[PDB]
């Protein structure tokens, strides 16, 4: 049985140690950028997430996710299905055949998008992008559609799931923990857990682990769900690599690491410097925003007369006797602010904060999506090039096969049933 020999929880707990460094970094990136987005496991319902002293990180994180989502999933069609290895007999001759299949492939793509938008995939995908920026990586799972139902895709935070990789980079095994109430459990799971023993109330929470492993015997991926150490019978199934609905997506890939790293972590050492500088500036102002009247004891003026006297009341005293305590750090304020401005401008181009054309967009436009896309390549590295290829294409593969069984497929010749997929910019035109 290979990897599943230990179980689903034993492997999950064993792999927590490797996940722990990534969780620590993800929390650190959150602390300086919208700390509510990645919360600590211990903290719940009374945390009162403290706002960062600097606001560049929270603003930058939203900007990157907003810019990515615009380029990653434009309003217009962003998937193109092409046919190859037999186009030689299809391109040279049969003009009518090309026209028929092109309309048919267009039929599949538009139907695919209607399933995305009607099922509220976009709202879940934007949440993943924000979690990709602050945390190392996110796992997106696409459950099978049953009948006519609204089934949102299920995103799993870095803490919830685990995945193992080798130096090659392919996925060996991945385990996911999910918390579901007993009353909310499906029919199959609730009857199995009741068979375990005892009586479970509706509010009672139990953990389910779905282990997806690569058996040594064959290259198929087998997945099973267990409740309190016992697998439910209906969970077992075999999926190929290309059609696995459990999609782990890493933004910044490193060789030999099962997990990706967050974009912000490279700037986290810099937001840390910016936060400290802005922390002192506000604290200096808090000292400044305090009134203390330093009365010179050798003076004539007595504060009892000043406080008791009404407005415009002649009081015996001398003006030089009364003085006020002031913060003297004028030179230190301007040097600290000067460095803070330099850091902010440095972070501005890193997070795509300043962009005049991008500021004003009245409607979605085909060229604008390309222009948004080009900027994500000129700066920010090649995340669009890599992350979308790890994101957009697997979503198209997994959704296509799932819908293909459900949807009706007309008579399509040879490779038309399974066309090659192009995503991102390269499918815009």
């Amino acid at each position: 049985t290979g990897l599943a020999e230990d179980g689903a929880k034993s492997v999950y707990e064993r792999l927590k140690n490797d996940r722990a460094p990534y969780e620590t970094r993800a929390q650190n990136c959150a602390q300086y950028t919208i700390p509510s987005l990645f919360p600590k496991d211990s903290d719940n319902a009374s945390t009162d997430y403290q706002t960062p002293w600097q606001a560049v990180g929270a603003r930058g994180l939203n900007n990157l996710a907003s810019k990515l989502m615009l380029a990653l999933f434009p309003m217009q069609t962003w998937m193109r299905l092409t046919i190859s290895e037999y186009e030689a007999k299809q391109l040279l001759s049969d003009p009518d055949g090309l026209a028929k299949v092109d309309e048919g492939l267009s039929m599949v793509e538009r139907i695919i998008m209607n399933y995305i938008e009607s099922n509220s995939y976009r709202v879940t995908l934007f949440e993943a992008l924000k979690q990709l920026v602050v945390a190392g990586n996110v796992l997106l799972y696409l459950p099978e559609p049953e009948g006519s139902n609204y089934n949102p895709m299920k995103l799993y935070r870095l803490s919830s799931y685990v995945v193992q990789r080798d130096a090659f980079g392919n996925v060996l095994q991945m385990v996911t923990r999910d918390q579901i109430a007993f009353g909310a459990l499906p029919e199959d799971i609730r009857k199995a857990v009741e068979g375990q023993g005892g009586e479970k109330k509706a509010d009672e929470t139990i953990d389910v682990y779905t282990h997806i492993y690569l058996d040594e015997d064959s290259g198929e991926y087998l997945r099973y769900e267990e409740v309190e150490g016992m697998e439910v019978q209906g969970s077992d199934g075999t999926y190929p690599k290309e059609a696995c609905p459990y999609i782990p997506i890493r933004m910044v890939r490193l060789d030999g690491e099962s997990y990706g790293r967050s974009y912000i972590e490279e700037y986290l050492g810099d937001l840390r410097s910016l936060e400290n500088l802005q922390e002192a500036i506000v604290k200096m102002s808090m000292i400044s925003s305090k009134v203390i009247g330093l009365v010179n004891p050798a003076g004539i003026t007595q504060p009892r007369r000043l406080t008791k006297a009404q407005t415009g009341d002649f009081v015996t005293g001398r003006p030089e006797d009364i003085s006020f305590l002031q913060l003297e750090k004028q030179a230190d304020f301007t040097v600290a602010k000067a460095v803070s401005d330099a850091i902010e401008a440095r972070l501005s181009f890193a997070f795509m904060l300043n962009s005049a054309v991008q500021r004003t967009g009245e409607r979605v436009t085909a060229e604008e999506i390309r222009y948004v896309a080009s900027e994500l390549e000129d700066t920010l590295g090649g995340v669009y090039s890599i992350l979308s290829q790890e994101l957009q294409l697997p979503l198209v593969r997994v959704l296509l096969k799932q819908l293909q069984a459900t949807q009706q497929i007309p008579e399509l010749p040879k490779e038309a049933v399974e066309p090659t997929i192009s995503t991102g910019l390269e499918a815009i035109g």
Binding site: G269, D270, R272, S273, N276
Partner: protein, 130 residues
């Protein structure tokens, strides 16, 4: 350094050898009452398991830095001249000599201390982390 109370008596002795008794933190909470360490914030002079404080302890004339020995002599020279045979001519010179003696001793203090405002500093060290 840790001051240990007598387990039977439960109170620490604040002997005259202790020139200064200060808490390691910002606010010092230990004062002298009846020759025994007294916690003014706690209104109790009975301690258990000991306390950690900062103490200046008296030493002999020896067992002192050499740079400080001349300053001790130069200050004592001024008072000794002043008290018994007060001569204005020698008194003026010793005042200049004492000011130089203090200057060297501070120069020793910075050399001995080796204080760093970037990394030795308590607050600034946490800021430099990147």
């Amino acid at each position: 350094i840790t001051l240990l109370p007598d387990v039977y008596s439960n109170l620490i002795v604040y002997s005259d050898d202790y020139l200064s008794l200060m808490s390691t933190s910002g606010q010092s909470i230990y004062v002298n009452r009846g020759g025994y360490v007294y916690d003014r914030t706690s209104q109790s002079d009975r301690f258990d398991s000991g306390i950690t404080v900062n103490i200046i302890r008296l030493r002999d004339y020896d067992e002192m830095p050499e740079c400080f020995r001349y300053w001790i002599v130069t200050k004592a020279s001024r008072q000794f001249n002043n008290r018994f045979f007060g001569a204005p001519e020698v008194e003026g010179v010793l005042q200049e000599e004492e000011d130089e003696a203090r200057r060297l001793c501070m120069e020793y203090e910075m050399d001995y201390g080796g204080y760093n405002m970037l990394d030795g500093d308590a607050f600034t060290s946490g800021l430099l982390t990147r």
